[PDB]
């Protein structure tokens, strides 16, 4: 005797020793990315090509 | 052969229900109810072939075979 068995219920595992089908379908995907930047450019100039007389000493 | 077209007209798949009486003994006879299961039209003059009647524990407690009586 295997005990009471439901008639219309779907066949499910209920006790120790019962079998069950596992459909292994795994799809995992993780990603991450980052960046940082900094820039600085500086140019400066001053030139006196021709200096008038009253400015010579300066 | 597995690959063959069988189109019958005189056969109907049926479900048989019965009552197990108190203190039932082997060799005793009981009444059964025969009910069609799919798209059959009538069971007026049919005959029920050897049918094992299972209990809740899925064990055979009776065997059913006979001629059906339908009011009509």
Instruction: Give the span between the Cα atoms of A9 and B57, in whole angstroms.
Output: 15
Give the SS3 label for residue A55.
helix
Q: How was this structure determined?
A: cryo-EM
A37 is written with which tokens? 């930047």
Contact B32, B11 (CB under 8 A): no
User: Counting one residue from A and one from B, how many pairs have CB atoms under 8 Å apart?
Assistant: 10
Contacts of B58 in chain A (CB under 8 A): 2, 5
Resolution value (Å, 1 decimal): 2.8
DSSP category for residue B10: S
Taking the alpha carbons of B55, B61, B63, B68 in that order, is the dihedral positive or negative? negative
Phi, psi of A23 (to 5 degrees): -95, 100
Provide the greatest CA pair distance for chain A.
126
For tokens 């795994």, name the residue.
A26
* Most A-contacting residue of B53, B57, B60 (CB-CB within 10 A), to test interface: B57
Paired with B36 in beta bridges are B14
């Amino acid at each position: 005797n295997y005990g009471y068995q439901p008639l219309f219920e779907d066949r499910r595992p209920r006790n120790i020793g019962d079998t069950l089908t596992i459909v292994l379908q795994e799809n995992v995907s993780a990603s991450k990315s980052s960046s940082a930047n900094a820039s600085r450019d500086g140019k400066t100039s001053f030139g006196f090509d021709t200096v008038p007389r009253y400015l010579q000493g300066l | 052969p597995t690959g063959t077209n069988m189109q019958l007209k005189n056969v109907a798949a049926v479900m048989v229900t019965a009552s197990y009486p108190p203190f039932a003994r082997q060799g005793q006879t009981i009444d059964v109810v025969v009910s069609s299961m799919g798209n059959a039209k009538s069971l007026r003059g049919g005959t029920l072939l050897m049918t094992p009647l299972k209990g809740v524990d899925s064990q055979v407690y009776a065997l059913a075979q006979g001629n059906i009586l339908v009011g009509g």
